[PDB]
Design a binder for this molecule. Structure first.
Ligand SMILES: CCN(CC)C(=O)c1ccc(Nc2nc(OCC3CCCCC3)c3[nH]cnc3n2)cc1
Length: 274
Protein backbone atom coordinates (compact mmCIF):
# COMPACT_ATOMS: atom_id res chain seq x y z
CA UNK A 1 0.00 0.00 0.00
CA UNK A 2 1.35 3.56 0.66
CA UNK A 3 4.53 4.89 2.31
CA UNK A 4 3.96 6.36 5.78
CA UNK A 5 5.06 9.98 6.25
CA UNK A 6 5.15 11.49 9.74
CA UNK A 7 3.30 14.77 10.23
CA UNK A 8 6.42 16.15 11.94
CA UNK A 9 8.04 15.97 8.49
CA UNK A 10 5.10 17.82 6.87
CA UNK A 11 4.12 21.49 7.02
CA UNK A 12 0.73 22.63 5.69
CA UNK A 13 0.78 25.99 3.91
CA UNK A 14 -1.47 27.85 1.48
CA UNK A 15 -4.82 26.41 0.46
CA UNK A 16 -4.87 25.86 -3.30
CA UNK A 17 -8.57 25.03 -3.57
CA UNK A 18 -11.08 22.24 -3.06
CA UNK A 19 -11.73 18.94 -4.78
CA UNK A 20 -14.71 16.64 -4.41
CA UNK A 21 -15.08 16.33 -0.62
CA UNK A 22 -11.42 17.35 -0.21
CA UNK A 23 -9.26 20.36 0.60
CA UNK A 24 -6.03 20.99 -1.30
CA UNK A 25 -2.93 22.56 0.27
CA UNK A 26 0.60 23.36 -0.77
CA UNK A 27 3.08 21.89 1.69
CA UNK A 28 6.72 21.13 2.44
CA UNK A 29 8.10 17.68 3.25
CA UNK A 30 11.33 17.13 5.17
CA UNK A 31 12.88 13.89 3.93
CA UNK A 32 16.12 11.99 3.49
CA UNK A 33 16.78 11.71 -0.24
CA UNK A 34 19.44 10.07 -2.37
CA UNK A 35 22.90 9.68 -0.81
CA UNK A 36 21.46 10.41 2.64
CA UNK A 37 20.97 14.11 1.85
CA UNK A 38 18.31 16.02 3.78
CA UNK A 39 15.75 17.69 1.51
CA UNK A 40 12.96 20.23 1.88
CA UNK A 41 10.46 19.07 -0.75
CA UNK A 42 7.37 20.89 -1.96
CA UNK A 43 4.39 18.53 -1.77
CA UNK A 44 0.69 18.62 -2.55
CA UNK A 45 -1.53 17.64 0.38
CA UNK A 46 -5.04 16.33 -0.28
CA UNK A 47 -7.14 16.15 2.89
CA UNK A 48 -10.45 14.28 2.85
CA UNK A 49 -13.28 16.26 4.43
CA UNK A 50 -14.16 15.15 7.95
CA UNK A 51 -17.87 15.34 7.11
CA UNK A 52 -17.21 12.79 4.33
CA UNK A 53 -14.99 10.22 6.05
CA UNK A 54 -17.19 7.43 4.63
CA UNK A 55 -15.47 7.88 1.24
CA UNK A 56 -11.99 7.18 2.65
CA UNK A 57 -11.75 3.78 0.94
CA UNK A 58 -12.53 5.24 -2.49
CA UNK A 59 -10.40 8.27 -1.61
CA UNK A 60 -7.26 6.17 -1.14
CA UNK A 61 -8.07 3.58 -3.80
CA UNK A 62 -8.03 6.34 -6.43
CA UNK A 63 -4.45 7.19 -5.47
CA UNK A 64 -3.51 3.52 -5.09
CA UNK A 65 -4.44 2.93 -8.73
CA UNK A 66 -1.93 5.51 -9.97
CA UNK A 67 0.88 4.37 -7.63
CA UNK A 68 0.78 0.74 -8.79
CA UNK A 69 1.67 2.02 -12.28
CA UNK A 70 4.72 4.02 -13.38
CA UNK A 71 4.59 6.40 -16.33
CA UNK A 72 6.01 9.80 -17.24
CA UNK A 73 2.51 11.29 -17.65
CA UNK A 74 1.10 10.13 -14.29
CA UNK A 75 1.36 12.14 -11.07
CA UNK A 76 3.56 10.62 -8.37
CA UNK A 77 2.17 9.71 -4.95
CA UNK A 78 4.69 10.12 -2.16
CA UNK A 79 2.52 8.39 0.44
CA UNK A 80 0.04 9.00 3.24
CA UNK A 81 0.40 11.20 6.31
CA UNK A 82 -0.12 9.85 9.82
CA UNK A 83 -2.30 12.33 11.74
CA UNK A 84 -4.38 9.79 13.64
CA UNK A 85 -7.92 10.65 12.53
CA UNK A 86 -7.18 12.50 9.28
CA UNK A 87 -6.93 11.11 5.74
CA UNK A 88 -4.13 12.95 3.92
CA UNK A 89 -2.52 12.00 0.61
CA UNK A 90 0.95 13.41 -0.13
CA UNK A 91 1.59 13.88 -3.84
CA UNK A 92 4.18 15.60 -6.02
CA UNK A 93 3.81 19.36 -6.41
CA UNK A 94 3.50 20.41 -10.06
CA UNK A 95 4.69 23.99 -10.41
CA UNK A 96 2.24 25.40 -12.99
CA UNK A 97 -1.01 23.99 -11.60
CA UNK A 98 -4.08 22.60 -13.31
CA UNK A 99 -4.67 22.82 -17.05
CA UNK A 100 -8.18 24.30 -16.91
CA UNK A 101 -7.03 27.43 -15.07
CA UNK A 102 -3.96 27.66 -17.31
CA UNK A 103 -6.19 27.52 -20.39
CA UNK A 104 -8.39 30.35 -19.08
CA UNK A 105 -5.60 32.73 -18.06
CA UNK A 106 -3.53 32.00 -21.20
CA UNK A 107 -6.56 32.13 -23.51
CA UNK A 108 -5.10 34.38 -26.21
CA UNK A 109 -1.54 33.01 -25.88
CA UNK A 110 -2.27 29.42 -27.01
CA UNK A 111 -2.41 28.25 -30.64
CA UNK A 112 -3.52 24.94 -32.13
CA UNK A 113 -0.01 23.46 -31.94
CA UNK A 114 0.16 23.94 -28.17
CA UNK A 115 -3.25 22.30 -27.76
CA UNK A 116 -2.34 19.41 -30.06
CA UNK A 117 0.87 18.66 -28.15
CA UNK A 118 -1.07 18.56 -24.87
CA UNK A 119 -3.77 16.41 -26.48
CA UNK A 120 -1.16 13.95 -27.74
CA UNK A 121 0.39 13.71 -24.27
CA UNK A 122 -3.00 13.12 -22.64
CA UNK A 123 -3.81 10.51 -25.30
CA UNK A 124 -0.50 8.78 -24.59
CA UNK A 125 -1.34 8.62 -20.88
CA UNK A 126 -4.80 7.23 -21.65
CA UNK A 127 -3.38 4.69 -24.11
CA UNK A 128 -1.02 3.53 -21.35
CA UNK A 129 -3.98 3.05 -18.99
CA UNK A 130 -6.03 1.28 -21.68
CA UNK A 131 -3.18 -1.17 -22.32
CA UNK A 132 -3.27 -1.97 -18.58
CA UNK A 133 -7.10 -2.21 -18.52
CA UNK A 134 -7.06 0.53 -15.88
CA UNK A 135 -10.09 2.83 -15.66
CA UNK A 136 -9.32 6.39 -14.56
CA UNK A 137 -12.92 7.61 -14.35
CA UNK A 138 -12.46 11.38 -14.00
CA UNK A 139 -10.55 12.67 -17.03
CA UNK A 140 -10.91 16.46 -17.13
CA UNK A 141 -8.78 19.57 -17.53
CA UNK A 142 -8.92 20.09 -13.76
CA UNK A 143 -7.05 16.79 -13.34
CA UNK A 144 -4.32 17.70 -15.87
CA UNK A 145 -1.25 19.36 -14.34
CA UNK A 146 1.33 21.42 -16.26
CA UNK A 147 4.82 20.26 -15.28
CA UNK A 148 6.50 22.59 -17.77
CA UNK A 149 5.34 25.50 -19.90
CA UNK A 150 6.19 25.84 -23.56
CA UNK A 151 9.64 27.42 -23.92
CA UNK A 152 9.90 29.89 -26.80
CA UNK A 153 13.69 30.03 -26.57
CA UNK A 154 13.74 26.59 -28.24
CA UNK A 155 10.17 25.80 -29.16
CA UNK A 156 10.34 23.20 -26.39
CA UNK A 157 6.81 21.85 -25.90
CA UNK A 158 4.88 21.87 -22.63
CA UNK A 159 4.71 18.73 -20.50
CA UNK A 160 1.56 17.63 -18.68
CA UNK A 161 0.72 15.00 -16.08
CA UNK A 162 -2.57 13.29 -15.25
CA UNK A 163 -3.61 13.21 -11.60
CA UNK A 164 -5.68 10.65 -9.70
CA UNK A 165 -9.46 10.60 -10.30
CA UNK A 166 -10.47 11.16 -6.67
CA UNK A 167 -13.55 9.59 -5.12
CA UNK A 168 -15.06 7.29 -7.74
CA UNK A 169 -18.34 8.11 -9.45
CA UNK A 170 -19.56 4.62 -8.52
CA UNK A 171 -20.02 5.83 -4.92
CA UNK A 172 -20.57 9.57 -5.39
CA UNK A 173 -24.11 10.88 -4.80
CA UNK A 174 -26.45 11.32 -7.75
CA UNK A 175 -26.35 15.13 -7.63
CA UNK A 176 -22.55 15.19 -7.97
CA UNK A 177 -22.59 12.92 -11.04
CA UNK A 178 -25.12 15.15 -12.80
CA UNK A 179 -23.05 18.24 -12.02
CA UNK A 180 -20.21 16.48 -13.87
CA UNK A 181 -22.17 16.27 -17.12
CA UNK A 182 -20.77 16.19 -19.79
CA UNK A 183 -17.62 14.62 -18.33
CA UNK A 184 -19.59 11.66 -16.98
CA UNK A 185 -20.82 9.64 -20.00
CA UNK A 186 -24.54 9.00 -20.56
CA UNK A 187 -24.33 5.31 -19.64
CA UNK A 188 -22.89 6.19 -16.22
CA UNK A 189 -25.68 8.70 -15.55
CA UNK A 190 -28.08 5.81 -16.17
CA UNK A 191 -26.08 3.45 -13.94
CA UNK A 192 -22.62 4.02 -12.39
CA UNK A 193 -22.19 0.23 -12.66
CA UNK A 194 -21.49 0.97 -16.36
CA UNK A 195 -18.06 2.44 -15.45
CA UNK A 196 -15.82 1.06 -18.17
CA UNK A 197 -12.77 1.73 -20.31
CA UNK A 198 -15.18 3.34 -22.78
CA UNK A 199 -15.94 5.93 -20.07
CA UNK A 200 -12.49 7.50 -20.38
CA UNK A 201 -12.86 7.80 -24.16
CA UNK A 202 -15.98 9.93 -23.68
CA UNK A 203 -14.38 12.07 -20.97
CA UNK A 204 -11.29 12.50 -23.15
CA UNK A 205 -13.52 14.03 -25.82
CA UNK A 206 -14.97 16.43 -23.26
CA UNK A 207 -11.46 17.32 -22.07
CA UNK A 208 -10.44 17.86 -25.69
CA UNK A 209 -13.35 20.31 -25.94
CA UNK A 210 -12.03 22.14 -22.86
CA UNK A 211 -8.55 22.44 -24.38
CA UNK A 212 -9.93 23.96 -27.59
CA UNK A 213 -12.35 26.25 -25.71
CA UNK A 214 -9.80 28.28 -23.73
CA UNK A 215 -10.94 27.00 -20.34
CA UNK A 216 -14.69 27.24 -20.92
CA UNK A 217 -16.71 24.60 -19.11
CA UNK A 218 -19.05 22.78 -21.53
CA UNK A 219 -22.75 23.23 -20.67
CA UNK A 220 -21.89 25.42 -17.67
CA UNK A 221 -24.98 27.55 -18.34
CA UNK A 222 -27.22 24.47 -17.91
CA UNK A 223 -28.44 23.35 -14.57
CA UNK A 224 -28.64 19.75 -13.57
CA UNK A 225 -31.97 18.93 -15.06
CA UNK A 226 -31.09 20.67 -18.26
CA UNK A 227 -27.85 18.69 -18.31
CA UNK A 228 -29.89 15.48 -18.04
CA UNK A 229 -32.15 16.62 -20.88
CA UNK A 230 -29.01 17.28 -22.93
CA UNK A 231 -28.28 13.54 -22.72
CA UNK A 232 -31.96 12.63 -23.16
CA UNK A 233 -32.17 14.42 -26.52
CA UNK A 234 -28.69 13.02 -27.27
CA UNK A 235 -27.13 16.33 -28.27
CA UNK A 236 -23.45 16.87 -29.02
CA UNK A 237 -21.27 19.65 -27.68
CA UNK A 238 -20.96 22.70 -29.95
CA UNK A 239 -17.95 22.78 -32.22
CA UNK A 240 -15.20 24.97 -30.72
CA UNK A 241 -14.10 28.05 -32.64
CA UNK A 242 -10.72 26.42 -33.13
CA UNK A 243 -12.51 23.53 -34.83
CA UNK A 244 -9.58 21.35 -35.95
CA UNK A 245 -10.53 18.75 -33.30
CA UNK A 246 -14.34 18.96 -33.46
CA UNK A 247 -14.62 15.70 -35.42
CA UNK A 248 -12.39 13.87 -32.93
CA UNK A 249 -14.42 15.29 -30.03
CA UNK A 250 -17.69 13.99 -31.48
CA UNK A 251 -16.10 10.65 -32.40
CA UNK A 252 -14.91 10.24 -28.81
CA UNK A 253 -18.23 11.49 -27.41
CA UNK A 254 -20.20 8.70 -29.06
CA UNK A 255 -23.46 7.82 -27.33
CA UNK A 256 -22.75 4.16 -28.12
CA UNK A 257 -19.83 3.14 -25.84
CA UNK A 258 -18.77 0.26 -28.10
CA UNK A 259 -18.18 2.66 -31.02
CA UNK A 260 -15.79 5.06 -29.28
CA UNK A 261 -12.33 4.72 -30.87
CA UNK A 262 -9.37 3.16 -29.11
CA UNK A 263 -6.68 5.57 -27.96
CA UNK A 264 -4.36 3.98 -30.52
CA UNK A 265 -6.78 5.21 -33.19
CA UNK A 266 -7.18 8.56 -31.40
CA UNK A 267 -3.41 9.09 -31.43
CA UNK A 268 -3.29 8.30 -35.12
CA UNK A 269 -5.97 10.90 -35.73
CA UNK A 270 -4.04 13.41 -33.71
CA UNK A 271 -0.83 12.74 -35.58
CA UNK A 272 -2.59 13.53 -38.90
CA UNK A 273 -2.27 17.30 -38.33
CA UNK A 274 1.47 18.04 -38.53
C1 LIG B 1 -0.18 31.28 -9.12
C2 LIG B 1 -1.39 30.45 -9.61
N1 LIG B 1 -1.04 29.01 -9.68
C3 LIG B 1 -0.71 28.41 -10.98
C4 LIG B 1 0.77 28.60 -11.33
C5 LIG B 1 -1.05 28.20 -8.43
O1 LIG B 1 -1.33 28.73 -7.41
C6 LIG B 1 -0.70 26.68 -8.41
C7 LIG B 1 -1.64 25.73 -8.07
C8 LIG B 1 -1.30 24.36 -8.06
C9 LIG B 1 0.01 23.97 -8.38
N2 LIG B 1 0.46 22.56 -8.39
C10 LIG B 1 -0.37 21.34 -8.25
N3 LIG B 1 -1.71 21.37 -8.37
C11 LIG B 1 -2.45 20.26 -8.24
O2 LIG B 1 -3.88 20.33 -8.37
C12 LIG B 1 -4.33 21.52 -8.99
C13 LIG B 1 -5.07 22.37 -7.93
C14 LIG B 1 -6.09 21.46 -7.24
C15 LIG B 1 -7.14 22.18 -6.39
C16 LIG B 1 -7.26 23.67 -6.70
C17 LIG B 1 -7.08 23.94 -8.19
C18 LIG B 1 -5.65 23.60 -8.63
C19 LIG B 1 -1.79 19.03 -7.98
N4 LIG B 1 -2.19 17.73 -7.80
C20 LIG B 1 -1.12 16.97 -7.58
N5 LIG B 1 -0.02 17.73 -7.61
C21 LIG B 1 -0.42 19.02 -7.86
N6 LIG B 1 0.27 20.19 -8.01
C22 LIG B 1 0.95 24.93 -8.71
C23 LIG B 1 0.61 26.28 -8.72
Amino acid sequence: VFHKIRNEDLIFNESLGQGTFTKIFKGVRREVGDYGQLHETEVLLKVLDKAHRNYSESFFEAASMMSKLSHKHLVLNYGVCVCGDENILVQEFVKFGSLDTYLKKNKNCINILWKLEVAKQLAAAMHFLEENTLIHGNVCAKNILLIREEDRKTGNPPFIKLSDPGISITVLPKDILQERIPWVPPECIENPKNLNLATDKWSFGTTLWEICSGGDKPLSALDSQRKLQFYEDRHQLPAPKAAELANLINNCMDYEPDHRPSFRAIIRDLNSLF
